[PDB]
């Protein structure tokens, strides 16, 4: 069976979240907890409490066994962008993007 | 660099303002115009 | 409107159609009487300041007054209502029988 968890409009650029999701994709959830709390990137604390919430949905709502759970799918979708500015040298402005992310993590015991 | 517009409360109300406007026949034309446009401040 | 806060009516539309009920409140500005026993509701009674966590709180909801029709007292079937002036005042009559 599968269990799910999402975090919507987390204010981190989706290019930056994606470097850390490529580390835990297809890993056993006991090993991926440690990869995320032994990594120095800004999205790591955010990604692992999406991962722990999906493991909690697995045992409480669906009566699963956390020992054999695996990261089945982990991805970041583009959320909506904010519009900002930066003043420049001679009267002109330039555009800042403040880009957000939707984050999804699926765990699975690998049975049918 | 010194810039144009050094503000001044008393100069502002003597050059632009209600009594100055209502003193001239062309100042009353300004205020009539702004009334038929419906501006929230006239002076 | 044409229904008051005491009349007993029948329902001719909605899913609770064919039910006899009593009127308990009118709300004339939006044209929706509140009949007793029809259009039951299930509201989520959250925890209040002076109440408990609760459950579902059954109650009644308004109904459009066009889905209701009075009951003449003689035959006891639905009917429209007219007026005839007597006693100097206005009087409701059943359009197929005598006065209400």
């Amino acid at each position: 069976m599968e269990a799910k968890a999402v975090a919507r409009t987390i204010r981190i650029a989706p290019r930056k979240v994606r470097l850390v999701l490529d580390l835990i994709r297809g890993k056993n959830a006991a090993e991926a907890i440690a990869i995320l709390k032994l990594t120095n990137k800004a999205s790591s604390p955010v990604i692992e409490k999406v991962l722990m919430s999906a493991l909690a949905n697995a045992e409480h709502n669906y009566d699963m066994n956390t020992d054999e759970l695996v990261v089945k799918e982990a991805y970041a979708n583009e959320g909506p962008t904010l519009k900002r500015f930066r003043p420049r040298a001679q009267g002109r402005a330039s555009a800042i993007n403040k880009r957000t992310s939707h984050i999804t993590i699926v765990v699975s015991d690998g049975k049918e | 660099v010194k810039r144009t517009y050094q503000p001044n409360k008393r100069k502002h109300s003597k050059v632009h303002g209600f009594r100055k406007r209502m003193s001239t026949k062309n100042g009353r034309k300004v205020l009539a115009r702004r009334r038929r446009k419906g501006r929230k401040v006239l002076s | 409107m044409h229904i008051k806060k005491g009349d007993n009516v029948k329902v001719i539309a909605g899913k609770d159609k064919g039910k006899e009920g009593k009127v308990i409140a009118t709300l004339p500005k939006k044209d929706r009487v509140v009949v007793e026993g029809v259009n039951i509701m299930k509201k989520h009674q959250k925890p209040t300041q002076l109440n408990p966590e609760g459950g579902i709180l059954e109650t009644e909801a308004a109904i459009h007054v066009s889905n209701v029709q009075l009951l003449d007292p003689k035959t006891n079937e639905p009917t429209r209502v007219g007026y005839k002036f007597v006693d100097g005042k206005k009087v409701r009559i059943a359009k197929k029988s005598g006065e209400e």
Partner: protein, 48 residues
């Protein structure tokens, strides 16, 4: 001084071939069955 053509999606995904990160050392602790970086202290009942 400025790009003459835009960069296609194909040419952009090839340049990003090597823009990735590797996992840390991250061995298991003998005191507590856990995970710690090699040659660092354990962040869980800190032993070494």
């Amino acid at each position: 001084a400025v790009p003459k053509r835009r960069t296609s999606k194909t040419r952009k995904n090839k340049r990003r071939t090597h823009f990735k990160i590797s996992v840390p050392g991250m061995t298991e602790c003998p005191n507590c069955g856990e995970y710690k970086l090699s040659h660092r202290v354990c962040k869980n009942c800190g032993s070494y």
